[PDB]
Enzyme design. Structure first.
Site, PDB file in Angstrom:
ATOM      1  CG  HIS A  41      -0.527   0.137   2.623  1.00  0.00           C
ATOM      2  ND1 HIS A  41       0.336   1.017   3.088  1.00  0.00           N
ATOM      3  CD2 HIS A  41      -0.428  -1.000   3.631  1.00  0.00           C
ATOM      4  CE1 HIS A  41       0.761   1.015   4.262  1.00  0.00           C
ATOM      5  NE2 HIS A  41       0.193  -0.418   4.653  1.00  0.00           N
ATOM      6  N   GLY A 137       3.761   6.016  10.597  1.00  0.00           N
ATOM      7  CA  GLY A 137       5.114   5.800  10.146  1.00  0.00           C
ATOM      8  C   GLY A 137       5.620   4.379  10.271  1.00  0.00           C
ATOM      9  CB  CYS A 139       3.214   1.165   7.620  1.00  0.00           C
ATOM     10  SG  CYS A 139       1.780   1.926   8.056  1.00  0.00           S
TER      11      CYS A 139
HETATM   12  C1  80X Z   1       2.261   3.621   7.894  1.00  0.00           C
HETATM   13  C2  80X Z   1       2.181   5.060   7.570  1.00  0.00           C
HETATM   14  O1  80X Z   1       3.459   5.742   7.441  1.00  0.00           O
HETATM   15  N1  80X Z   1       1.302   5.511   6.711  1.00  0.00           N
HETATM   16  C3  80X Z   1       0.991   6.905   6.149  1.00  0.00           C
HETATM   17  C4  80X Z   1       0.237   7.637   6.871  1.00  0.00           C
HETATM   18  N2  80X Z   1      -1.127   7.092   7.399  1.00  0.00           N
HETATM   19  C5  80X Z   1      -1.377   5.858   7.231  1.00  0.00           C
HETATM   20  O2  80X Z   1      -2.171   5.265   7.397  1.00  0.00           O
HETATM   21  C6  80X Z   1      -0.082   4.990   6.875  1.00  0.00           C
HETATM   22  C7  80X Z   1      -0.510   4.324   5.369  1.00  0.00           C
HETATM   23  C8  80X Z   1      -1.566   3.342   5.069  1.00  0.00           C
HETATM   24  O3  80X Z   1      -2.006   2.623   6.135  1.00  0.00           O
HETATM   25  N3  80X Z   1      -1.985   3.191   3.976  1.00  0.00           N
HETATM   26  C9  80X Z   1      -3.116   2.206   3.416  1.00  0.00           C
HETATM   27  C10 80X Z   1      -3.337   2.446   2.194  1.00  0.00           C
HETATM   28  C11 80X Z   1      -4.396   1.474   1.667  1.00  0.00           C
HETATM   29  C12 80X Z   1      -5.093   0.620   2.330  1.00  0.00           C
HETATM   30  C13 80X Z   1      -4.569   0.509   3.697  1.00  0.00           C
HETATM   31 CL1  80X Z   1      -5.144  -0.978   4.569  1.00  0.00          CL
HETATM   32  C14 80X Z   1      -3.762   1.247   4.239  1.00  0.00           C
END
Ligand code: 80X
Ligand code: 80X
Lengths: 286, 300
Positions: A41, A137, A139
């Site tokens: 993602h 951040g 992820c």
């Molecule tokens: C972890 C991180 O840095 N971020 C950026 C800021 N916000 C967040 O949520 C995450 C990104 C994220 O989760 N994206 C996502 C996109 C499509 C489906 C799903 Cl399930 C998730």
């Protein structure tokens, strides 16, 4: 003496963490050999084939500390993006990708935009979530176990569920639990308590001096366990607890009888902890 | 979201762990620059566990009496000296993996991470708090002496703890890296016991703030309290006195949540009075006190 939620030393995994940026999204990646692994993602009801097809290699910025890595190819395996880079990680540990069962434990190295910040010990819940600690951040942080200097990677973090618990995949991109990488209406199922881990933990308690709870059959224990939302105890579990009965002198069914009485503090907690496998108890209470 | 007893990444410290052997006693050592630090009781024999004279024991030693190993590599000891309860072995090779580091002495109520090692080999990492009675509730087996505790400021490791002994109650005692014991403890195996321990009040309050930050307010009430009334009550539950210094420290968490410190104190008084009533706070049925106000801000 003593007993702690103890994690594996994290140095071998720290040397593999990198920052991955695509567009406006920055998250963590795992750099092994000449491949960086990160949630797909990073390129975002999406169509991941079309999204990746329109990406070029210079649309992925991989920042390894103070050195930018050149992406020379991009692929996808299930829910994980595989970025091929021009250099292999000289710090790659002996590793394998594994997939774990609910009830098994692993260590999590929480990183933020490539930089490790903290390490902690988790269990895969019966509902396939983990009760971790992840901020924005984080992820792409990975979970792992270490066995004779071989790192078994078992988990990559993708998202947080509305109940405050977390969902992710193995390192082959296959989700744990009935979850999808879409920011949509998802929720954890009803959780249960890991019986064999509670029993192993009670064994740790008698090894470390707590015996006040000591006092059945497998069939009668399971009859009460199902009413208290405990997983059924199998003979596999009973055999697995053998070494702890052998060290403590307490039959598995005797420990079950004690657990029954407790359902009807130990090791510093008012709750029956269930995030310690029989293996964890032995490794720490050797 | 979520909240765990999270330890610092341990790689910077793993690269400093070595094995130190003197006679048939083996424990762990900390290798920074060209010095290996370890507890001085490595030079004790079975005859002088009770009343060793360390000055006398050491003058009878040669550098070649100290076997030091970094993994497969034997390091050459080229000198030795003693600073309080820590033995300092000078070696011919500086540690190429030396992180930026400081030696610090922590106050009770402060937290640090412990890298548990056996025979110079790290086995696990976990989070500890220095108890008001100057012990830690760790997880150490035989062979763990010399394991160290630390915090990481950015890329600098602050070493605050080296493990020496286990007390009859199960708790653990050690020194800072100057070799000075935390608390009234000595590296002798005569009968010693920790003083009465207390609950770290400022940490429980910080943790209650963490619970609010993560969405839980059920434990709050409409009351306030004076600082002295609070201490008069909390001390009857064996809590450490809350000082104005502590109240100042909780400032940022108060501002972040809008809840005055003494209003959170009023909540704590009621929680002590009532219990959890079948509920949990951040996953625990007890009032946790091993999270500092600084830990809460960093993890939240
Ligand atoms: C972890 C991180 O840095 N971020 C950026 C800021 N916000 C967040 O949520 C995450 C990104 C994220 O989760 N994206 C996502 C996109 C499509 C489906 C799903 Cl399930 C998730
Ligand atoms: C920790 C460890 O690795 N070991 C080596 C094997 N056996 C041990 O007893 C310990 C060392 C130890 O605790 N000794 C001691 C001696 C004099 C006073 C005090 Cl306080 C302690």
């Amino acid at each position: 003496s003593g007993f702690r939620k103890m994690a594996f030393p994290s140095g071998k995994v720290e040397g593999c963490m990198v920052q991955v940026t695509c567009g406006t999204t920055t998250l963590n990646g795992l750099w092994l050999d000449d491949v960086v692994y990160c949630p797909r993602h990073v390129i975002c009801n999406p169509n991941y084939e079309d999204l990746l097809i329109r990406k070029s290699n210079h649309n992925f910025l991989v920042q390894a500390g103070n050195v930018q890595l050149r992406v020379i190819g991009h692929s996808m395996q299930n829910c994980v993006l595989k970025l091929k880079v021009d250099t292999a990680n000289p710090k790659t540990p002996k590793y394998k990708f594994v997939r774990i069962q609910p009830g098994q434990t692993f260590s999590v190295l929480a990183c933020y935009n490539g930089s490790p910040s903290g390490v902690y010990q988790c269990a895969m819940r019966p509902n396939f979530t983990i009760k971790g600690s992840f901020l924005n951040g984080s992820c792409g942080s990975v979970g792992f176990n270490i066995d004779y200097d071989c790192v078994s990677f078992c988990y990559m973090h993708h998202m947080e569920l509305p109940t405050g618990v977390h969902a992710g995949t193995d390192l082959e991109g296959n989700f744990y639990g009935p979850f999808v990488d879409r920011q949509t209406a998802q929720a954890a199922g009803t959780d249960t308590t890991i019986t064999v881990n509670v029993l192993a933990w009670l064994y740790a308690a008698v090894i470390n001096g707590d015996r006040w709870f000591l006092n059945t059959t497998l069939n009668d224990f399971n009859l009460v366990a199902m009413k208290y939302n405990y997983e059924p105890l199998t003979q596999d579990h009973v055999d697995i607890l053998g070494p702890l009965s052998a060290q403590t002198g307490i039959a598995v069914l005797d420990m079950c009888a004690s657990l029954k009485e407790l359902l009807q503090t130990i090791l510093g907690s008012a709750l029956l902890e269930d995030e310690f496998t029989p293996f964890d108890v032995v490794r720490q209470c050797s």
